[PDB]
Symmetry: D2
Subunit: 454 residues, 4 copies
């Protein structure tokens, strides 16, 4: 029920029913820190990187077609979800991520050996370093997998959910474009606007956020692979960097390119620091939108109550805005994640930044949170937003903001005293214009038109 695997330090027992090797077993035993492991997206990006590396090595005659094809088949099994329990290492490992690199090397090598009729272990047909890490160093693969995982998650998860939410709110803005409501500035009653105009603010924010996220993608698309140990490219084929970047782009349809400067690519996590800046921008925007929604829906009777939202969980009328709560809670998380990333990104030394598992742990979490959170908020809240037209009108007409519709029909002097009297006395603006008798109730209803004040 165990197997003896070897590395440059000796032999160690690994679980017989597992595909990993000596370096993984050592890391697994030396970093028993908390519960965070590499996320599946990073595992898949690592498998993709080894699949592209294998194909390019084959193309260059540096690795046999049998070994190359067996490696790509094993990597496709990882990508297909067959080997999730084969990657047990903690986030809190060596700062370069090289132990997770070896975890992929060993799992792919053993599984490739099986696929060629060999065994897993010392006598395997495919070797983790010699074959699966061929033309790679210990230092330039993990940074590559970080950018592959990050770019694919922004393109395939976050941007599509962002676009869907924007379209829902754009539709809602159009449907409610002629519902006039009271404005609120400093939380006080203010000049009116339409519910559709207010939502159009939310829509415009999400469109700006999309642009900012898109501006960050070209830097993330630059890959370190080919820099080898310190960025010089020593001990790799001079076409390898460009060729692997080219293969990754083919098999993902994403515009990966090799990093024009490998020293910047290995010494920093700057592309992710910058990209996460755009995500904390989105988190601040989503906080605002979520808060507007839950405040406008507050009630049923002692809040604002201008809109209603769907009731999805198990005393009538009480609807806790639980999607707004999950959303605001994960927006706080993104702000915190940004500080952790900023500290790691600032803390590179010389030729290599060794804060990488932590940086990518936070970055991919922020993407999951923002993508899944907008998907959940959209389907369980935003699509169901409806006005409470009686309440909106009650608030608007019983307010004192509409007095300014009277200044060319009575002068600022008399309207001001209607406003003052109605307020000291607790009256409408109609009732206070009648008691002082500067107006008839037909004169009011024709002069104070909220629909022309927007």
């Amino acid at each position: 029920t165990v197997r003896s695997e070897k590395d440059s330090m000796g032999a160690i027992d690994v679980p017989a029913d597992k595909l990993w090797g000596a370096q993984t077993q050592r890391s697994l035993e030396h970093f028993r820190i908390s519960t965070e492991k590499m996320p599946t997206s990073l595992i898949h990006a690592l498998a993709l990187t080894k699949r592209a590396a294998a194909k390019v090595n084959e193309d260059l005659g540096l690795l046999s077609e049998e070994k190359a094809s067996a490696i790509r088949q094993a990597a496709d099994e990882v990508l297909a979800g067959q080997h999730d329990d084969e990657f047990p290492l903690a986030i809190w490992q060596t700062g370069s991520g090289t132990q997770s690199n070896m975890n992929m090397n060993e799992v792919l090598a053993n599984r490739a050996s099986e696929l060629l009729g060999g065994v897993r272990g010392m006598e395997a047909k495919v070797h983790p370093n010699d074959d699966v890490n061929k033309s790679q160093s210990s230092n330039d693969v993990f940074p590559t997998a970080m950018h592959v995982a990050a770019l694919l998650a922004l393109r395939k998860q976050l941007i599509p959910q962002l676009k869907t939410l924007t379209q829902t709110l754009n539709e809602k803005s159009r449907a409610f474009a002629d519902i006039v409501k009271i404005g609120r500035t400093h939380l006080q009653d203010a000049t009116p606007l339409t519910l559709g105009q207010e939502i159009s603010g939310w829509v415009a924010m999400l469109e700006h956020n999309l642009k900012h996220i898109e501006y960050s993608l070209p830097h993330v698309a630059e890959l370190a692979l080919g820099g080898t140990a310190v960025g010089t490219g020593l001990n790799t084929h001079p076409e390898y960097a460009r060729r692997v970047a080219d293969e990754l782009a083919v098999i993902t349809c994403a515009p990966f390119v090799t990093a024009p400067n490998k020293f910047e690519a290995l010494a920093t996590c700057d592309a992710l620091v910058q990209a996460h800046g755009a995500l904390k921008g989105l988190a601040a925007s989503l906080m605002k939108i979520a808060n507007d929604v839950r405040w406008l829906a507050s009630g049923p009777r002692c809040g604002i109550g201008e809109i209603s939202i769907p009731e999805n969980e198990p005393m009538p009328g009480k609807v806790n805005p639980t999607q707004c709560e999950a959303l605001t809670m994960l927006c706080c998380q993104v702000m915190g994640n940004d500080v952790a990333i900023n500290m790691g990104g600032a803390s590179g030394n010389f030729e290599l930044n060794v804060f990488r598992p932590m940086v990518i742990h936070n970055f991919l979490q922020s993407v999951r949170l923002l993508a899944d959170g907008m998907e959940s908020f959209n389907k369980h809240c935003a699509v169901g937003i409806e006005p409470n037209r009686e309440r909106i009108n009650q608030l608007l007409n019983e307010s004192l903001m509409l007095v300014t519709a009277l200044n060319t029909h009575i002068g600022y002097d008399k309207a001001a005293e209607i406003a003052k009297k109605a307020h000291k006395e607790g009256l409408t603006l109609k009732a206070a214009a009648l008691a002082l008798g500067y107006l008839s109730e037909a004169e009011f209803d024709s002069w104070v038109r909220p629909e022309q004040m927007v």
Copy 2:
């Protein structure tokens, strides 16, 4: 392979092999956000809270001995690790944590029913709300479980690992108390001190941190249970708050007490905001210590190299300080976690703070990271720290800092010109005192005594 469970909203299918109920199934389906779930420590704190609530209800004749005893037996099974797959809810749920409260209510109720020869579900012998949540509201249990989990993890995990690491470094400080080395200020050569004096700085920092963490514990030990819905205690026995706090203290041996002001306890997460302030203090101290260790061990030949550390992973002499890398990486994480907690803690509204799953998610993660990280750093690094005495002496004697040992034997004028000549010329201070001939090599070796300059 399914079961129909009911709540105030209707009936829903749950997995037949699971013990949860309708509210858990709904939350599980409505918050498909990322992968973070409640940590085991929080689950256990919830089970402890229900076990104490049951015992107190029994004491007050509010619940039968059969039901009460079956609930405590089920909770003990949770505490014993038999039901880990029965708690599937996300962190990113309702902000009060009430859905995880219901998850514990339903699992304990069904399992209790089984333990009394009943079924799980509609016809169960024990009811989630009526029995397991008896004398509790939906709002005051989750805050209680937060403080129970946090206090127990600080007392049982973090403080013992902190104490162990402090003792290791205190021993190392004693063993190396008479090894003189060059000091470094602004990263430049400076006035000497002993390696034991330098480590005593690390020791003193960890002793201060322990005090700061201990000062935060009395506020965390205040429990919200008994405040019920808004803090007034309406709809609970007037002795319930004190009695449950008293029972929790009995069964954990921790000094839990009921919160003197339930409005502060429900409306805020202030005790954890303050407590996490002490943890980010520890993270900043640990960053410094870890960096000192990896810098002092840098080499083998082109760094500082004054100490050696154990080599635990698989080109001689290269030892990557991987424990220092994991430690500094998790210290960044704690700084980020603190910002997320601060934002949640600042964002309470009226009678209830609804940022709680996020706050406790971050807080318990910081405790795991700091506790497990000091345990790992201690056993795989700190215990093995050794001086490189030849290197320490080489640096010290070949430096220019020891010139000031000559000012009462030659005056500040001649020593200054030895220092200047040795530096322009690339000589020792002995060699430069010989070429200008102000001293004999026996006069030097008797006057420049590093051991008296500390």
Copy 3:
């Protein structure tokens, strides 16, 4: 209109009408970075430190009574506000703060020389290094001034304003202890409580914050002076550390003591990292209180409107809560300051932390903001908080939360259908109990008693 001053690097022109010297002029010209300078509190703490150092040197016969007395008289002039334009250095200077140390040395030395009938400059009677920095190093004075300034500002500014605000809100809580209002959880209508009970939550938070701030003071009271260059105390009298700490305590009435471990005191800013943790705790509490106040006062007609606040600035009824805006804005600032401090505190190296001007800049700013902000919020807002009793009662009685007062007079079944009918139909709970005729309006007014539900 210039004067030639000298240091170990040569001669440089300083403004003739200024008291500073060569090192100050150099720093002034080399760090033209932004506009932040040392705050007055830090200048005063530096002057206090030199006044105590002078007195102790005199006591030890290390400095003449004439020079010592002239130095203390000059320092008293600084403390008296006569020399504010004599300290022009930026925060963004050398990381040890040693240039601001020299700024105090030179200003005090020249002014002391004047006070003895000498000139300012090369021929002065008192020397900046030889006399004013006597028994001090370049490294242990600035950390001392940081802790002196921080401790005095917490004791003399922040804690008294915190105590005053707490007393105002405690009085308001007592005055409104029997005004019943609707509770709000998740922003939804909930179980009632009194306005005084709600404010008592604010009061309890501020009392907890005071305790947390007080727990941080003993570590701040530890002073580095006497550690000299690297903490060994080399080149100072063996009683100097304790004696100066003792003199500082005499002349400030604050419990300053010498740091038991000088290596921790020079290598870190841990005491301020920990102390600022308590201040960001206060900022989160103050955010919550300020938000409760501005939300409860929102209106005049389309918000909550349960309380009124004073109108201090220049359309009736609109009162922008501008004190709440200043307060919440400075609470954000404290959260940001905490991150800057945490990064600096984590970034010490070997024998000296050289992030100190930045750390103390942020820390003293947070204290000014919190102290002055609570003083301003108290006098221009909190003291004037009044209930709007008609509005509070309107909301409470027109809500659906009071239905549960009927369950022992009608059973949960009939009350639930009153609640449902009133809500589908837009009625009071009285009106809906009449239409279905389960109650008389005298039966209602006797059964639904809000004053017994708190």
Copy 4:
């Protein structure tokens, strides 16, 4: 020595020698919070906004040529630095910034009146609201001044200093392109690279940062002016928004445009949240570069010592890297500023974000710090960076990294045992290849060529 000025609240005394009015005096007395005031750049942006507003009002016949021309002349005096003591308001004021808007209205109105032969005060010829705020609301001017100030400071200060620093390091990278040095990964000796290759990493980082900053400028260039009170544009000429944006662009040569969605422009600070994300990216990059410089220059004898830097301040050889200290200290500040900005940006409510003075205070500080800090670092440090060629070669040749130059001349087996022997024994790789006699010293010097390993 006082003057009675009036607003809608009454009359108040202002200093007779000052140009401000009633609203400024009130704000000045009600927000005695700390010492931070609006920075000059914001004052100038406000003056620019009023100068453009005046010109456009004149164009539309809404204001006389005399009044319009007098306002623009007064604003030009502000821009010319004649009125710096006329703007005394705190950052910690009303959250909309409207009191600083009124401060500019009153100062320009009084000074304009003087320029027309009138008095300052009640009888002035030009009115603050009626004339200087004409066609503007209280809510849309301050956000406009924020974006004007931010865009101009990024274009005129930060980007030019960033470009200058990049050019210096690009020149240094070219000059040192063939100096081979030891690489460092995880702080351990690693594969060699040239000093010019390493600096090219710094250069590439700064070029990426420039691109990221440039991507943020189009959103900052969108101006809120014309949205008036809540974004609807009610009570302003329908061409005003576009016309003022157009005039601002003329007189600044910056591409200002009117915000396509005024609700997003008033309800959020999203453009600055996003733009500050790029600045904290730059801060993390600058931290890394500064740390590389001070570590490489550490010495003179017990550090790395591979480069030298200029000595600008007043024991030979000790050069404290004080420019690196100021730079790293202000990079921490930017990280903290980003959190304060993120919290303010996330905290908008409905139609107006009222965290604006705090947001712009932090944002313009980060720009001053980064711009002035790179200017100071460039001129007092970076331009003077020189290699220590003897030290670089000593480290490189005495290291064990060059063993791999022997594997096709001896096989990995014998080289590995040279590496091992030299390390256990404390020898060079030449000396250890001689003792075991696998090589002649002429065979070594011809095979181990560092210049071909990069």
